[PDB]
Design a protein around this nucleic acid. Structure first.
Ligand SMILES: Nc1nc2c(ncn2[C@H]2C[C@H](O)[C@@H](COP(=O)(O)NP(=O)(O)OP(=O)(O)O)O2)c(=O)[nH]1
Ligand SMILES: [Mg+2]
Ligand SMILES: [Mg+2]
Length: 430
DNA sequence: ATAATGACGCT
DNA sequence: AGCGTCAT
């Protein structure tokens, strides 16, 4: 109608590093480049757990969380890089540092929200606005968009992928309304031009390739990112949403991958995101709550308002290690020693954070899991973090959890702990 | 024995 | 405060 908002107010990108840990190891070791390759944690149990996979290895069926011994059965030529181990635990510093390389480059173009170690959202709205004045209503050349797919195009009236890519791009650019500096489709297009530029800059300055989604919000941007991978970017326009959503499994949409997604499917008897449009906002709210219902009602029409938060730095700093199976910690001395290994890594990172980013954590969260409980955390307790000292932090953590030891003999520890987790939080400016 | 983290909602 | 969800 004449008053309906169409969720076309922003230009948002989601940039995701293609098999990131593998790229970091391949940059460092040229012998691993353009080879079936994976990154592995902990060599000893079944060759190690695989945590990142090159696209050459994926084609053999190698996946994350697969044991390396098992992936070698699928892919005998598979090359492996091992994650650094410090103080008896996986240490991800190399990938954190590579990540900062990428996020600093992206920060030159626009406002970014760090989403994970290898993903960031980009609010390109302002950047596009200014680019559109620089562009005298000039046509946008296909040459400015050499790795961009236009989702849903080509339509109607070739046999190779790049064939199809440029046909869709041509149909899109031929149709564009470049006189109108307010057309959402033009804005997205200009957004796509800037993300090409950002991705060229990242590759030139780090050697890392990545993929991107460009759309009007974060959920659509994230979804778009995954449509054409690797080293490609996808524009998802508002107009493309009805066809895209009509066969889009509900669980593919960000935040609908877990329990809420499954109950949407089971309570409503539907499979695809677009089927949600039949329901009133009140019906949706009555099944899933006021906030979830409102969000679904707007999302299945391609509309979502979660802002890109200007936050390039993590809000918590944490250290964690699982002790599965027979390795579960069963004695007081073990528990203490590992709390100390965690606290030491933590102090390193905290101190580094206090020098690099001018801030100071003030609360220490202590999380454990007990044997048999399959919840992530069996128990969470906090205490003050007054001093970046590894021995104080570990002793404090021991203190606030020790009474979970139900054992009679207190040389031993029951029930066995299957996880330790130290998280520094509640940062103050320093 | 699908890790090591991280952000946020509910009460 | 502490637990639950969702995610890479
Ligand atoms: N230990 C562990 N690390 C993981 C896992 N999954 C991801 N990581 C670590 C390692 C990853 O390199 C990195 C990024 O995660 P993604 O973006 O979800 N996948 P990637 O970047 O590998 O490939 P692409 O994006 O092209 O699909 O975070 C896992 O299951 N376990
Ligand atoms: Mg990635
Ligand atoms: Mg990612």
């Amino acid at each position: 109608g004449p008053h309906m908002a169409t969720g076309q107010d922003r230009v948002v990108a989601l940039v995701d590093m293609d098999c990131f840990f593998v790229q970091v190891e391949q940059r460092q070791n040229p012998h691993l480049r353009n080879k079936p390759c994976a990154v592995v944690q902990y060599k000893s149990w079944k060759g190690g757990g695989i945590i990142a996979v090159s696209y050459e290895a994926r084609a053999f069926g190698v996946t994350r969380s697969m044991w390396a011994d098992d992936a070698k059965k699928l892919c005998p030529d598979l090359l492996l890089a091992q994650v650094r181990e410090s103080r008896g635990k996986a240490n991800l510093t190399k990938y954190r540092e590579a990540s900062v390389e990428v996020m600093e480059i992206m920060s030159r173009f626009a406002v970014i929200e760090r989403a994970s170690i290898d993903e960031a959202y980009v609010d390109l709205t302002s950047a596009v606005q200014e680019r559109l004045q620089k562009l005298q209503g000039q046509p946008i050349s296909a040459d400015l968009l050499p790795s961009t797919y236009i989702e849903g195009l080509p339509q109607g009236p070739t046999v190779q992928k790049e064939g199809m890519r440029k046909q869709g791009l041509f149909q899109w650019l031929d149709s564009l309304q470049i006189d109108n500096l307010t057309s959402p489709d033009l804005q997205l297009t200009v957004g796509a031009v800037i993300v090409e530029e950002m991705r060229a800059a990242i590759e030139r300055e780090t050697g890392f390739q990545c993929s991107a989604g460009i759309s009007h919000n974060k959920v659509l941007a994230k979804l778009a990112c995954g449509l054409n991978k690797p080293n490609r970017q996808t524009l998802v326009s508002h107009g493309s949403v009805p066809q895209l959503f009509s066969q889009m499994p509900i669980r593919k949409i960000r935040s609908l991958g877990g329990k809420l997604g499954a109950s949407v499917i089971e309570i409503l008897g539907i499979e695809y995101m677009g089927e949600l449009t039949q329901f009133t906002e009140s019906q949706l709210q009555s099944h899933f709550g006021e906030k979830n219902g409102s969000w679904l009602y707007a999302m299945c029409r391609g509309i979502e308002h979660d802002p890109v938060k200007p936050r390039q730095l993590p809000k918590t700093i944490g250290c964690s290690k699982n002790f599965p199976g027979k390795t579960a910690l069963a004695t007081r001395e073990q528990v203490q020693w590992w709390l100390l290994q965690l606290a030491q890594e933590l102090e390193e990172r905290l101190t580094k954070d206090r020098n690099d980013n001018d801030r100071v954590a003030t609360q220490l969260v202590v999380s454990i899991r007990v044997q048999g409980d399959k919840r992530l955390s069996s128990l969470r307790r906090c205490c003050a973090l007054t001093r970046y000292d590894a021995h104080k932090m570990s002793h404090d953590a021991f203190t606030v959890i020790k009474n979970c030891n139900t054992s009679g003999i207190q040389t031993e520890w029951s029930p066995p702990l299957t996880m330790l987790f130290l998280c520094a939080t509640k940062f103050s400016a320093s």
